[PDB]
Amino acid sequence: SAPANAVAADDATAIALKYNQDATKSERVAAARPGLPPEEQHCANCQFMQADAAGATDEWKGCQLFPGKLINVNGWCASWTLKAG
Amino acid sequence: SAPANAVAADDATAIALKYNQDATKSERVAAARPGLPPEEQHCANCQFMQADAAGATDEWKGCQLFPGKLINVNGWCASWTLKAG
Ligand code: SF4
Ligand code: SF4
């Protein structure tokens, strides 16, 4: 089961930022954010994902943009940015 | 007159996010978002602010949560998080 502090689907920030815990159901094709084809975009390779968040698991990680919460590594939002060198 | 796409108080996203174009009149103290003293928080030091948005001025700048629109640099909403990276 999801952590209790998972980002909720209809959290107001999640709504505004176009977060979806399943990237395949997200607006990523429409958004056309640069750096990878949309089909390759998800939280796991994002700049803002925080691997060392409290309560992180292989599936659930922090995000700079959702303080105190956990996103799904297979998620996406409109701030997706490939983590660069 | 302000940019045509300045965020209005009756914008539906604004209401959901608890945006106020005057941070001093916002809920920022009670909300106590982490990362800076709440009384110092406003759009100008927020991670979501986009200073190079089309139509921006020294007063009106972009926000990732209000695509296509301009917030006030002195504003605040409950999604505030410190600009960082
Ligand atoms: S900023 Fe990155 S890690 Fe955070 S929810 Fe959006 S895509 Fe996922
Ligand atoms: S997310 Fe940040 S920049 Fe956007 S309205 Fe809220 S406080 Fe202002």
Swiss-Prot record, chains A, B:
Record bears the keyword Iron-sulfur: yes
Keyword Oxidoreductase: no
Keywords: 4Fe-4S, Electron transport, Iron, Iron-sulfur, Metal-binding, Periplasm, Signal, Transport
GO cellular component: periplasmic space
GO terms for biological process, alphabetical: aerobic electron transport chain
Family the UniProt entry places it in: Belongs to the high-potential iron-sulfur protein (HiPIP) family.
Subunit structure: Homodimer.
Function summary: Specific class of high-redox-potential 4Fe-4S ferredoxins. Functions in anaerobic electron transport in most purple and in some other photosynthetic bacteria and in at least one genus (Paracoccus) of halophilic, denitrifying bacteria.
Name recorded for this polypeptide: High-potential iron-sulfur protein
Organism encoding this protein: Allochromatium vinosum (strain ATCC 17899 / DSM 180 / NBRC 103801 / NCIMB 10441 / D)
Residues represented out of the complete protein: 38 to 122 of 122
